[PDB]
Design a protein around this ligand. Structure first.
Ligand SMILES: C[S@@+](CC[C@H](N)C(=O)[O-])C[C@H]1O[C@@H](n2cnc3c(N)ncnc32)[C@H](O)[C@@H]1O
Ligand SMILES: [Zn+2]
Ligand SMILES: [Zn+2]
Length: 874
């Protein structure tokens, strides 16, 4: 107890629980955190500080003791109070916050306070093991208190030695010095101040229970004198009549994005100009240029007022939760949330995934891609001829409620596509655009980005669905509809394709691929495929026009050149004035209708995988340039083995399965990375990991087992981890729903489980329990899956054993013996250990109790729905 600070510490440790709680607040400045805490709990992301820290930092910033500017690095950001505060500061350009996550430590909170798009917070970082990087401002609020000041000195010195590695001559800084009164800390502080300047300043918002002082860059003052003055002040507050803490107002951190000047995109305004001006004239009443727009790699054209769309909410399907009670304690089931489709939820995803640039492929890569696409269009075009689809074909499609992409119908003029298509006024609008397309002009073909409502383990932000105007969708169908209409990507035509295949018969295809001689089976996922589509890809896909003539070639060239290679997009954004619709543009990336996307993603993925196959086989040595001899080699390889190399793949969209000639493919990565098709959750140059068991190969969110029947017949069945299936079934799409609509949704899940996951003990039990607890005549409602391969044969009131027989026996091409199954008892399960491996609770007492007492839970749901006609399926 030699220093004044140590004398304070002894006195502080001698206090009792109540005297300490009283002393802690005596005469200090305090922010009333109640409105922010409440607002944040309601899900409010604007205005509120995530902690007391924003006010603490503001106290220093307002006095010019620290001037945050340029790149700000915040060490131990916690919830992000200092980071979010800095985000709204004029001279700040970028905020990087690093914090240790996990138990006992605060996790970063997502906020939409002013300049949030310039702030990136990172959890799971021990800053003591982080490589220092360039910054203009270094903030640090690390220092855990302890009754032992020697322990505190050690902790403080560890922080001081850390901050030193991140400091240079021009660095602005605000560093917490937890224990500034210990002699070892004074000594290190003196050394640090001699080199970097600054001084130790006490914040009046600090509690008396701490002697923390901050090392701020713009202050001046003697360390010993400053520290002893705070010890004296802190010792005096012991015996001073409890003065209440002076209440300060909490900080208003505003709202909205910020523009820092990065604009990396040159639009072709001769191509996109008419489209922008039409939007601009239609919204003249609210049109403005927002100088704080967040777009970096997308050209910004202006904004207009719009009414907010999408939801952040998520409801539990009670019918399913009541009938799957052992899963209430499994986090991988319960932490399943719905995606945030609101303008903030969307903007967060845009920032992270969509506002990115893909590097231009090298000269050899470009040659490889052009040669392969030329060859591949000629292959697909052998037994098929490109044609124009018709208005009557399109009309038939909308009438029959068939598969069209995401479409907008002009809510004023027409409420539905059916209402529109049946009106001659709609086709007059189509003709005006058609005639403009015939003269290389585009005026209406603009995409409406809307958040995709998905179930994920979050809550996570939303992916974008690119809606087209029904007229823009017709012009696309007329020109490129033949790819889907005539099945160019069917397995018979494209040998890699799986177009028109139900999700249940995809395992039979993976089995036929495994029958080939070769290496392991590779199933690498691309990190955001649609954003990784270059202008090279778009120009190589356009080459299908070389197989077209006259009016059809001019119309398809308009879709490619004007609408795909020069996209105009409308996206929502939250602002201090309310929600706005932004007009933005991008030349590269995938932006087409959902159906044409599928085909062009299959084509380009078929082409990228053949190139990855040529690389592994050494058909070309370098991507920098392709020699005249390597061109002849690539063309001969394609002409000689191209078709059998296509037969080694199952290519859905961006989703692929490849059984190469050998495992040289695992490390054949230079062309893949250069094409921009970078693999997900793996270091760029780390070799791929394949599978030596086809039943373990992931494809279209499933793996597939071989299932031996009682009669010896073999089924190949779709399977997934059981928690993904239950977790998804237990979440209802949206908010505000009647029990009728919920029970019909759970019934769609139950019947999906009966047709596809019958081999899963817990799922066949839970599915029969839902169908018993839901009135038998009730029609199943809403989508169970987004899957383009989902057949939805479970969306019926027809006997599920009759449907099972039709799918698995009658219509199954890999089922030679057409003998129907007389009962569900005849249908098998996976082996008990196979089932347990894929997430089954079979063999647990809790699951046994659940199964034994399932009639109690069936009756509980029956009571909540009310006495109706029920059939027992148990
Ligand atoms: C006092 S809080 C910061 C308050 C923050 N400035 C705010 O306004 O929200 C310090 C944070 O540092 C974190 N932390 C502690 N040791 C760390 C380490 N080695 N690396 C990174 N963060 C760490 C703690 O989890 C804690 O949330
Ligand atoms: Zn157009
Ligand atoms: Zn399985």
């Amino acid at each position: 107890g030699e220093t004044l600070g140590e004398k304070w510490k002894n006195r502080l440790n001698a206090l009792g629980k109540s005297e300490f709680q009283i002393y802690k607040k005596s005469g200090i400045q305090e922010v009333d955190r109640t409105l922010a805490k409440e607002g944040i709990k309601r899900g409010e992301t604007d205005h509120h500080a995530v902690s007391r820290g924003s006010a603490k930092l503001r106290w220093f910033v307002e006095r010019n003791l620290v001037t945050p500017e340029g790149k700000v690095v915040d060490l131990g950001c916690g919830r992000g109070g200092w980071s979010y505060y800095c985000g709204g500061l004029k001279n700040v350009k970028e905020v990087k916050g690093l914090t240790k996550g996990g138990p006992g430590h605060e996790e970063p909170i997502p906020m939409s306070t002013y300049g949030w798009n310039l702030v990136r917070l990172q959890s799971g970082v021990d800053v003591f093991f982080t490589p220092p990087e360039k910054c203009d401002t270094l903030l640090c609020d690390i220092g855990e208190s302890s009754p032992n000041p020697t322990v505190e000195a050690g902790r403080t010195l560890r922080v001081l030695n850390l901050v030193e590695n991140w400091l240079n001559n021009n660095t602005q800084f605000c560093i917490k010095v937890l224990n500034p009164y210990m002699p070892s800390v004074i000594e290190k502080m003196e050394a640090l101040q001699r080199k970097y300047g600054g001084a130790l300043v006490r914040n009046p918002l600090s509690r008396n229970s701490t002697h923390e002082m901050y090392w701020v860059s713009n202050a001046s003052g003697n360390i010993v004198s400053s520290v002893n003055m705070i010890s004296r002040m802190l010792i005096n507050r012991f015996t001073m009549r409890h003065k209440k803490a002076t209440y300060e107002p909490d900080v208003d951190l505003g709202s909205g994005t910020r523009n820092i000047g990065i604009e990396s995109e040159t639009p072709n305004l001769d191509i996109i100009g008419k489209r922008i001006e039409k939007i601009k004239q239609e919204h003249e009443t609210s049109w403005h240029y927002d100088q704080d727009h967040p777009y970096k790699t997308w050209a910004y054209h202006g904004s207009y007022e719009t009414k907010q769309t999408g939801s952040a909410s998520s409801m539990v399907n009670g019918v399913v939760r009541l009938l799957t009670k052992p899963w209430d304690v499994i986090p991988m089931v319960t932490q399943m949330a719905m995606t945030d489709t609101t303008p903030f939820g969307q903007q967060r995803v845009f920032k992270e995934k969509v506002d990115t640039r893909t590097q231009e492929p090298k000269e050899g890569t470009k040659k490889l891609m052009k040669i392969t696409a030329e060859w591949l269009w000629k292959e697909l075009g052998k037994k098929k001829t490109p044609r124009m689809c018709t208005r009557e074909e399109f009309t038939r499609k909308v009438r029959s409620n068939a598969a069209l992409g995401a479409i907008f119908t002009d809510e004023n003029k027409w409420k539905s596509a059916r209402e529109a298509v049946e009106d001659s006024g709609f086709w007059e609008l189509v003709d005006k655009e058609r005639n403009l397309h015939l003269e290389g002009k585009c005026e209406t073909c603009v995409y409406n980005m809307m958040g995709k409502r998905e179930k994920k383990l979050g809550a996570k932000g939303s992916r974008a669905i690119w809606y087209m105007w029904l007229g823009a969708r017709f012009l696309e169908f007329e020109a490129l509809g033949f790819l889907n209409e005539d099945h160019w990507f069917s397995r018979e035509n494209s040998l890699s394709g799986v177009e028109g295949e139900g999700l249940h018969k995809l395992g039979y295809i993976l089995r036929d691929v495994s029958k080939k001689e070769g290496g392991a089976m590779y199933a690498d996922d691309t990190a955001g495929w649609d954003t990784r589509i270059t202008l090279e890809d778009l120009k190589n896909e356009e080459m299908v026009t070389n197989h077209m003539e006259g009016e059809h070639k001019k119309l398809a060239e308009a879709i490619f050149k004007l609408t795909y290679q020069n996209k105009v997009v409308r996206v929502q954004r939250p602002t201090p004035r309310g929600t706005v619709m932004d007009i933005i543009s991008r030349r590269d990336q995938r932006g087409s209708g959902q159906v044409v996307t599928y085909g062009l993603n299959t084509f380009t993925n078929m082409e990228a995988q053949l190139i990855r196959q040529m690389e592994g086989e050494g058909v070309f040595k370098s991507i920098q340039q392709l020699t005249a001899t390597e061109e002849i080699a690539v063309k001969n390889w394609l002409v000689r083995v191209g078709r059998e190399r296509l037969s080694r793949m199952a290519i859905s969209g961006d989703d692929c399965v490849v059984k190469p000639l050998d495992d040289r493919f695992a490390s054949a990565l230079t062309a893949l990375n250069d094409m921009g098709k970078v693999r997900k959750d793996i270091q760029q140059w780390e070799p791929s990991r394949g599978w030596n068991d086809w039943t373990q190969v992931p494809f279209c969110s499933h793996h597939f087992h071989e299932l031996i029947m009682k009669d010896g017949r073999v089924l190949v069945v779709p399977c997934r981890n059981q928690d993904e299936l239950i977790g998804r079934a237990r979440i209802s799409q949206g908010a505000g729903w009647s029990l009728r609509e919920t029970a019909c949704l759970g019934k769609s899940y139950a019947q999906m489980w009966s047709l596809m996951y019958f081999h899963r003990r817990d799922l066949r039990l839970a599915a029969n329990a839902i169908c018993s607890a839901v009135p038998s005549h009730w029609v199943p409602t809403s989508r169970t899956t987004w899957s383009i391969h989902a057949t939805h044969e479970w969306m019926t009131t027809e006997d599920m054993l009759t449907v099972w027989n039709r799918v698995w026996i009658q219509e199954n091409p890999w089922m030679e013996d057409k003998t129907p199954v007389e009962s569900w008892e005849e249908i098998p399960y996976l082996g008990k250990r196979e089932d347990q491996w894929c997430g089954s609770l079979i063999g647990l007492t809790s699951r046994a109790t659940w199964a034994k007492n399932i009639q109690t839970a069936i009756n509980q749901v029956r009571s909540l729905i009310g006495n109706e006609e029920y059939t027992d399926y148990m």
